[PDB]
Design a protein around this ligand. Structure first.
Ligand SMILES: Nc1ncnc2c1ncn2[C@@H]1O[C@H](C[C@@H](N)CC[C@H](N)C(=O)O)[C@@H](O)[C@H]1O
Ligand SMILES: Nc1ncnc2c1ncn2[C@@H]1O[C@H](C[C@@H](N)CC[C@H](N)C(=O)O)[C@@H](O)[C@H]1O
Ligand SMILES: OC[C@H]1O[C@@](CO)(O[C@H]2O[C@H](CO)[C@@H](O)[C@H](O)[C@H]2O)[C@@H](O)[C@@H]1O
Lengths: 248, 249
DNA sequence: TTGTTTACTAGCCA
DNA sequence: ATGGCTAGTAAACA
DNA sequence: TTGTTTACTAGCCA
DNA sequence: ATGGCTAGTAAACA
């Protein structure tokens, strides 16, 4: 395991104290959504119970942010207004990013529009948070270049280097047979996590994942060169995280 | 003006008495986002608690106008969506959170954030027996995509042979100024998405309310789809365009 | 071209 | 207050 | 092929 | 407390 890469198979809430306050540049928080998934009982909480537990781990993770830190939190629309409304009292919301998973959730419903997107709250401790777009700009290919280029835009940073990813990221969910896929139920694309890691944490900086699971953020910090602290209570997920960071 | 489509050049929050309680099948509300736009008025200049109290006020007037099967779509920005949705969940139940991918991002010149190309829409319902019909809004596959999707497991399926759910993310590009449908409105919404709402959550003949009709896109939607419509808008210029868009059908 | 699957069925009736 | 039966649900990876 | 624009800069300075 | 100046921000309509 590399320098700065820390994998703790420990309950984050008990072992948060073991992490120094104001010592993490970025928190990549993909916690249980409260959707009844089989991880333990972590995602088997619903309603005000789940909201209370969410707040409980958030008040432990927030103080560990440096004055320049930022945070991305994954959630479902079913709870996003409340969790975001709470986090707006503690930090400032810089963005709401929509992961358009392209592939919709199945079930067989016809009484509503099917879920295709996940909500991501992008918060910051202060207005002097760190944000660097250049590493995450998306380049135009030759054809997309020739289409967007005009003598009003020639030389513009968005044209030559790349455009802003925007607050909706259209990336397909990892198929079970995808090369990236491992033995985790709710994996996250490396594209997404890597974008966030590059855009809000200095090189060699510290990224905390209170609910790390497969080490997706761990892999994202291994490459791109950033320090990482992870917390996953499931032994098998920590194993797969190790294998994922020990193959780069 | 056609029958069943009513256009009012007044303030909504004050004519709410006129509207009967439990008469509206569907509310399609596109309110001021609290963003500083100039609608010819200063309604979108409110921010923070001012904006949110004003929002909750007009909402407390609009909600009783929905009959039990009633539903509501509400446009908003991510800066105020958590609070607005949190309040509305105490009144009605949230069925969906639809994200309007406007495809074209907001301009300004920032490099410290992610440019906006999403608007939030809250889909709430009064009861669990709310009206909803997906078949009018199913998206049919074309001769190439259905072929790419058709497997023996899916042959004869409702979603394959007819059309799939539009999902809670609608990637409909914003209306360019030179676009044919575009009128002289600062924040015009495309006819596609409002027509989708009108077709799905309002039965043929039902009454739709747009407290902030603007250019009357909901009026055109209700006229083209055989649904009654009522609207409110203080700008007479916007109401004039709202008219013209309906008489042109 | 094809098997298969991913964080988000639901309304009745009993 | 609580299950079970039903008609039903996409895009994209290997 | 090309002009033009649409609900959402941002920090500094005199 | 107030503009102004800067360095910038894109898909898609006509
Ligand atoms: N108290 C807890 N502390 C640390 N991890 C937890 C805790 N409770 C649940 N978890 C784990 O958090 C993970 C949530 C996952 N959605 C994270 C997946 C991860 N983002 C990935 O891309 O693979 C689950 O695997 C849980 O086992
Ligand atoms: N009290 C008010 N009552 C009725 N309309 C109002 C009020 N305040 C502001 N408005 C208008 O509400 C509209 C908000 C816009 N989103 C309407 C756009 C409209 N959905 C369209 O299709 O273009 C503005 O045109 C306002 O002038
Ligand atoms: O608006 C529904 C919304 O509420 C949530 C919590 O955000 O669930 C709560 O409210 C439901 C109302 O239908 C109850 O069924 C549920 O018991 C309660 O927790 C979400 O599940 C849903 O998105």
């Amino acid at each position: 395991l590399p320098s700065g890469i820390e994998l703790h198979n420990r309950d984050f809430l008990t072992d948060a104290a073991h992490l120094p306050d104001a010592s993490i540049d970025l928190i990549v928080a993909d916690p249980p959504y409260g959707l009844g998934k089989d991880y333990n009982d972590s995602d088997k909480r619903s309603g005000d119970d789940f909201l209370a537990w969410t707040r409980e781990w958030l008040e432990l993770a927030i103080p560990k942010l440096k004055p320049s830190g930022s945070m991305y939190i994954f959630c479902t629309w079913q709870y996003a207004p409340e969790i975001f409304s709470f986090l707006k009292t503690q930090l400032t919301m810089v963005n709401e990013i929509i992961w358009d998973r392209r592939v919709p959730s199945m079930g067989g419903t016809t009484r509503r529009f099917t879920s295709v997107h996940d909500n991501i709250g992008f918060f910051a401790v202060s207005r002097a948070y760190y944000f660097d777009l250049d590493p995450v700009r998306i380049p135009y290919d030759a054809d997309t270049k020739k289409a967007r280029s005009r003598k009003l835009f020639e030389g513009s940073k968005w044209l030559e280097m790349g455009y802003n990813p925007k607050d909706v990221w259209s990336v397909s969910r990892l198929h079970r047979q995808h090369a990236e896929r491992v033995d985790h139920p709710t994996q996250k694309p490396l594209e997404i996590i890597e974008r966030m890691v590059l855009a809000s944490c200095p090189p060699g900086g510290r990224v905390l994942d209170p609910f790390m699971g497969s080490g997706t953020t761990a892999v994202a910090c291994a490459r791109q060169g950033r320090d990482f602290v992870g917390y996953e209570i499931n032994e098998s997920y920590c194993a797969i995280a190790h294998e994922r960071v020990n193959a780069l």
